Design a protein around this nucleic acid. Structure first.
Lengths: 81, 106, 68, 108, 75, 84, 93, 169, 101, 74
RNA sequence: AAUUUGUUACAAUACACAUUUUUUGGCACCCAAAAUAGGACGGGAAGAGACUUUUAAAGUGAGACGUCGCGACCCUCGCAGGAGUCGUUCUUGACUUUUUGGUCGCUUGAUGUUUCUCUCUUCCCGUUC
């Protein structure tokens, strides 16, 4: 599907994540699979209650992801032709 | 489910005849017998309308205290009352017992 | 070295309790048959959470564990 | 057998789709996907009132209901009316279909 | 279908949150397609670092369904 | 089409400033761009309009108009905008 | 307001500004571009609106004015698991 | 001509105002130079489409009234309108800004029409109106506006808001 | 034996067996014999329903089913009964289904 | 690398006792001797006791579903 | 002296799938508050009680994340998502460079989460009988 292919097209760019637990992981996307589980590099974390920390590497399960924010300039990307 | 010719015995009356006198139960049968034709699908809608009701294993009729059955046969008559009525075009108030019997018996 | 499926094949028509995951309710009864998903059928079951229940079908997702 | 293929013959009928939230949707029914995704047309979707000394209703369903944009300001009780709601399949709990249709023809 | 790629993570000490409440730290050993992750020298992290922390076992395996996020504290 | 403003109050915030600009320029014509992309501030703002006539009118009328203390210096843009 | 085609599916509608409901009681409003088998969809310029707990109490039955805290997040990709129902807001440019 | 439903339907609701919200409607062939002499009738044809912004600039409207319940509407641009009074109960909770430049609104007529509010609008422009000239007009406007974030591009001064509140008390 | 090895007809015979001989045979024998069944959902609301149809996922069509739901707040209980003429029930909500005598 | 279900097979044959945590909603943890398992990580436990969260009652030889499994810990 | 028919390829829709990564559910629960025959209800302002702080005098349940904002003894020049290059012909593709706000107070911005414990009087403006 196109929605996952756009996530593969976002590799190497700063993205935002909302886990269904309520946290927010914003940072640079290293890897992504077709199971939507991604791993991110040099990422700032916001706990559900707002406490913010910083971690160098993270791997998240795709089932727990809620929405992913992708750099806007991918809107006109050829997937949408 | 029978692929072969055979004789099978079953009781049409079931609970109602066992509860209520024999003259009246045939009459409640005939009120039903006219009705299920006029109840194309609402039969299973009205007969099962009280889900507390269950059919006994030996028996055919839904076994019940027989008060809703008097309500069931009355609702069913009104469905017969309108369907006989609409084809000839009669008012529901114009319907009388001599007409209501003529609907039942004809 | 028994695995789950032969363990259910060995527990057929034996008295088995089954604990669901919710209220800590367990149905105690003679197992009848099981599906691929481990759906359960029971005869003469009793609900413990005190009652007596003639026949039971239990869907696979709600069971916690099965014991004899 | 997939019983969802039954719902696909219920098209253009008045129906209530009663969801997992407790939210109930009255509407005219359109094509039902094989995953039971149900798409309706003219729908009044609401939440029942548990009375029980005014016990608090679903807190998530009220927010999701106001956020459809269809709840009008002057509604005293909790309802919303809108056109074209599309419902994911896994959200459905019960479906109350009309009394008129006969099952013996449609269940084949 | 596809195996998750933890290949750079294994043998490195890793913290991962089990469910909403929990956080377990251990040296990652192995993993599978469901993300089930087996690790050794497990420790359950809590508010008080030396105090409420208690080790689990020599080898612990985790169902991939309860895994939320996995961070490696390591190179 | 575009009108490059200059000599305005830098102390005011960006979004607010943009809003103000929009409010100002709605009388002449339909404002296509709310605020300049560069957002350097301190006067530098490109008010993009739909019609050239409207822009011209704006230039005429709001030359040295009191906006947040200082008089705004209106002028026509050198290059055409990216949106237009 | 806006009348959607009496028979229109998620494929028929593209570039319409939609209103998406999730399981958590928040909404994502924006242009739909793609979607998928399991119905995780891609919104272009999207703003998530939320209902305040005090606002939620106000919504309980008795003209109401709710303060809906919302934040803007562009070009997202939702997850089909979270999506609950979808409504149409506007029609394309 | 008069503001009908057909005109509204015709109006270009394609190009969205990208500053805030969506659907920047311009009623008739063009709301800018539509020449709506009567009050804004047939507001129901829009049906609260979508900080929804409506541009009514360069039109004949005498009174800011006759609106249908519009939840979305946040911005009204009313420039070059012969507004005299704008009293209403429809657009109260809704709306974040109001641009009234080059109109006929009275200093007392503008103050009378609102009737005061605990909270209202947030952005207001009354420039090129007779009332603004009137002595203590800014103080009177601040007292009338009740809560306010702006007054003719300059914010009512925090100290000015305090003194105005004291005058109100 | 896994399901991906079998052919198109072997799955049909497998489903025919599972319905005829298996756990769901409790529902099947309940559909033919017109015996009312009791169904508990996850919601915790119990329906007394007569099963017109059923399916693999356990989703089933019931007519004349009666719904029974109680609610309590601070140990103040009330029992509520709701009658619906026609019901289609999605099968993921159900937990226990018993066949009445 | 040590695949996780391989490790579980090393819990079956080595006869080591294991404590196993369930989902946070149930509030009990099981412990016993893991005998055998399936592809779904649902396991049979011989001589199992359920501890609420040490007075717990002994269970038996019990099949436990893999859906509720959180940890399997020695 | 463009239409119709046949064949080939691509794209879209419906014929699939209940076992940890999306659609056959870890599901549900905090609890409690209006009845009459001038009267209620909401919002704003003032006073008082009880709370806090200092050694009688000062404002209104308390303690914690962020969120965008009101001031500034600071910085800061001032007109260019786009820009350059090459191919190609009067504006297109392929390949490279990478966002104002950078900060501090708030002599109570303004405002949402989350734990614990227990209001009356007066005026002004709207709704209802």
């Amino acid at each position: 599907g196109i929605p996952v292919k756009l996530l593969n097209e976002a590799q190497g760019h700063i993205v935002s994540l909302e886990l269904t637990t309520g946290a927010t992981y914003r940072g640079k996307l290293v890897e992504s699979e077709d199971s939507m589980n991604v791993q991110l590099r040099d990422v700032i974390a916001t706990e559900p209650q707002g406490a913010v920390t910083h971690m160098d590497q993270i791997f998240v399960r795709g089932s727990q992801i809620k929405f992913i924010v992708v750099p806007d300039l991918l809107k006109n990307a050829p997937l949408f032709k | 489910k029978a692929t072969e010719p055979q004789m099978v015995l079953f009781n049409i009356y079931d609970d109602w005849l066992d509860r209520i006198s024999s003259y009246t139960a045939f009459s409640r049968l005939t009120l039903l017998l006219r009705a299920l034709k006029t109840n194309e699908e609402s039969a299973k809608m009205i007969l099962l309308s009280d889900p507390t009701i269950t059919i006994k294993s030996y028996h055919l009729w839904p076994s019940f205290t027989d008060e809703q059955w008097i309500t069931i046969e009355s609702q069913m008559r009104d469905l017969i009352l309108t369907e006989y009525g609409r084809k000839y075009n009669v008012n529901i108030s114009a319907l009388t017992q001599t007409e209501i019997k003529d609907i039942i018996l004809g | 070295p028994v695995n789950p499926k032969p363990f259910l094949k060995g527990l057929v028509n034996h008295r088995v309790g089954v604990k669901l995951k919710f209220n800590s309710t367990e149905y105690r009864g003679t197992l009848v048959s099981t599906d691929n998903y481990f759906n359960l059928q029971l005869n003469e079951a009793e609900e413990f959470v005190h009652g007596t229940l003639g026949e039971i079908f239990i869907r696979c997702n709600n069971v916690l564990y099965i014991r004899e | 057998m997939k019983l969802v293929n039954f719902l696909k013959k219920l098209r253009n009928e008045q129906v209530t789709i009663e969801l997992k939230n407790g939210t109930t949707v009255w509407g005219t029914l359109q094509s039902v996907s094989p995953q039971m995704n149900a798409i309706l047309t003219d729908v009044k979707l609401t939440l029942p009132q548990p009375r029980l000394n005014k016990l608090n209703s679903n807190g998530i369903a009220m927010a999701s209901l106001y956020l459809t944009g269809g709840q009008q300001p002057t509604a005293s009780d909790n309802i919303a009316s809108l056109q074209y709601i599309n419902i994911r399949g896994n959200t459905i709990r019960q479906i109350i279909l009309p009394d008129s249709l006969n099952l013996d023809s449609l269940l084949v | 279908v596809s195996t998750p790629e933890l290949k750079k993570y294994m043998d490195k000490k890793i913290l991962l949150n089990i469910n909403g409440s929990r956080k377990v730290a251990g040296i990652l050993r192995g993993y599978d397609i469901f993300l089930n992750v087996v690790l050794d020298d497990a420790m359950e992290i809590n508010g008080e670092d030396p105090a409420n922390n208690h080790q689990l076992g020599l080898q612990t395996v985790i169902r991939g369904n309860s895994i939320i996020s996995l961070e490696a504290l390591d190179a | 089409n575009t009108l490059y403003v200059s000599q305005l109050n830098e102390k005011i915030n960006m979004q607010r400033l943009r809003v103000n600009l929009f409010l100002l320029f709605a009388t002449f014509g339909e404002v296509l761009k709310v605020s300049m992309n560069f957002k350097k501030q301190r006067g530098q703002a490109f008010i993009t309009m739909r019609t050239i006539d409207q822009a011209s009118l704006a230039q005429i009328s709001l030359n040295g108009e009191r906006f947040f203390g200082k008089p705004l210096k209106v002028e026509f843009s050198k290059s055409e905008t990216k949106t237009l | 307001k806006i009348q959607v085609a009496h028979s229109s599916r998620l494929a028929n509608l593209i570039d319409y500004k939609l209103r998406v409901l999730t399981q958590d009681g928040r909404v994502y409003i924006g242009q739909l571009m793609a979607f998928d088998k399991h119905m995780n969809l891609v919104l272009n310029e999207c703003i998530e609106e939320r209902v305040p707990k005090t606002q939620l109490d106000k919504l309980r039955p008795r003209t109401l004015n709710i303060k809906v805290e919302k934040r803007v997040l562009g070009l997202t990709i939702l997850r089909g698991e979270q999506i609950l129902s979808t409504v149409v807001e506007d029609k394309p440019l | 001509m008069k503001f009908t439903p057909s005109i509204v339907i015709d109006a270009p609701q394609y190009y969205v105002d990208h500053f805030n919200g969506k659907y920047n409607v311009d009623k008739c062939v063009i709301l800018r130079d539509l020449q709506l002499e009567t009050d804004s009738e047939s507001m129901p044809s829009s049906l609260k489409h979508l900080t929804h912004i409506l541009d009514l600039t360069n039109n004949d409207l005498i009174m800011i009234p006759d609106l249908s319940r519009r939840d979305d509407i946040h911005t009204l641009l009313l420039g070059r309108n012969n507004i005299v009074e704008v009293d209403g109960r429809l657009l109260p909770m809704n709306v974040q800004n109001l641009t009234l430049s080059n109109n006929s609104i009275r200093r007392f007529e503008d103050l009378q029409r609102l009737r005061r509010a605990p909270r209202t609008l947030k952005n207001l422009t009354l420039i090129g109106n007779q009332v603004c000239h009137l002595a203590n007009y800014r103080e009177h406007v601040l007292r009338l506006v009740p809560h306010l974030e702006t007054l003719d591009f300059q914010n009512v001064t925090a100290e000015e808001r305090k003194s105005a509140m004291s005058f109100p008390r | 034996r896994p399901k991906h090895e079998l052919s198109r007809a072997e799955l049909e015979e497998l489903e025919e067996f599972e319905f005829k001989h298996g756990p769901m045979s409790l529902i099947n024998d309940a559909m033919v014999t017109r015996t009312p069944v009791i169904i508990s959902l996850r919601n915790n609301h119990k329906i007394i329903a007569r099963v017109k149809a059923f399916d693999r996922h356990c989703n089933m069509v019931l007519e004349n089913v009666k719904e029974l739901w109680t609610e309590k707040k601070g140990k103040n209980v009330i029992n509520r009964e709701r009658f619906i003429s026609k019901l289609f029930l999605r099968g993921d909500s159900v937990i226990v289904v018993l066949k009445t005598p | 690398m040590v695949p996780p279900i391989n490790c579980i097979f090393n819990f079956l044959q080595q006869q080591t006792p294991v404590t196993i945590w369930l989902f946070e909603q149930i509030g009990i943890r099981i412990k016993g001797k893991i005998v055998g398992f399936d592809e779904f990580m649902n396991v049979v436990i011989d001589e199992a006791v359920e501890i609420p969260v040490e007075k717990g009652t002994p269970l038996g030889k019990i099949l436990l579903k893999g859906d509720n499994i959180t940890l399997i810990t020695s």
